[PDB]
């Protein structure tokens, strides 16, 4: 039931314009867990299956077998948006601590942040 940072949920991102990612696709909860408990919104990064490999520091690969996906996919840390929890459909899985470390680093790059 609870929403935790690093969970992967099915979410409806439509509608969108231009090059924004869209439709109903898996997304990763990147919001802090306090928000994920009390806030009406979560912050997510989109997952895409149109590429299984990605040459970009804002991209993170995820294998289909471990994470129960349809096929090997990529987390896009340059496509992030705040969603009302009413958009969150089913819970697919959650990322390992290691994978969440990679997600975190990619996010640090996307937003130009430094430790």
């Amino acid at each position: 039931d609870p929403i935790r940072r690093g969970d992967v949920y099915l979410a409806d991102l439509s509608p969108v314009q231009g090059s924004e990612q869209g439709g109903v696709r898996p997304v990763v909860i990147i919001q802090n867990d306090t928000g994920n408990k009390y806030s009406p919104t979560v912050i997510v990064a989109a997952i895409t299956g149109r590429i299984n490999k990605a040459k970009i520091p804002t991209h993170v690969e995820i294998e289909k077998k471990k994470y129960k996906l349809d096929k090997d996919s990529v987390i896009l840390l340059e496509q992030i948006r705040t969603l009302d929890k009413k958009r969150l459909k089913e819970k697919l899985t959650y990322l390992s601590d290691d994978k969440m470390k990679e997600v975190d680093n990619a996010l640090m790059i996307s937003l130009g942040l430094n430790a």
Partner: nanobody, 115 residues
Framework: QLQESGGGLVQPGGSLRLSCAAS????????MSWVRQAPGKGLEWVSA????????YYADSVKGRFTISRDNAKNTVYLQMNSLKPEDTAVYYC??????????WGQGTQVTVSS
């Protein structure tokens, strides 16, 4: 829903392995804590571990003597207690920690350290 095991009576300097088995809820969504209670003297929080296992926490009184761990496939938490001393005698509860409060509580297991 949460069943403790592994408690017992040991001599000072001994060790024990407590375990807590979860059912009826999705174990992959909670952080876990161990808290203990000695007779009369109030409840003392002992340890904790995040949902994925990467991050662990301990009270100053048990720090370095105890080791917390999780198996999310078996939906189980463990506490390894070493260098036990009489002051460690207490009942040991597993509990679920979610951001700030507890939700589900185990039934406890007794631990006694005396000659």
């Amino acid at each position: 829903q949460l069943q403790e095991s592994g408690g017992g009576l040991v001599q000072p300097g001994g060790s024990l392995r407590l375990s807590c088995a979860a059912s009826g809820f999705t174990f992959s969504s909670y952080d876990m804590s161990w808290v203990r209670q000695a007779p009369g003297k109030g409840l003392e929080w002992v340890s904790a571990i995040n949902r994925g296992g990467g991050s662990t926490y301990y009270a100053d009184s048990v720090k370095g003597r105890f080791t917390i761990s999780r198996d999310n496939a078996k939906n189980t938490v463990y506490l390894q207690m070493n260098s036990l001393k009489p002051e460690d005698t207490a009942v040991y509860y597993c509990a679920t920690w979610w951001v700030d409060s507890y939700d589900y509580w185990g039934q406890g297991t007794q631990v006694t350290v005396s000659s």
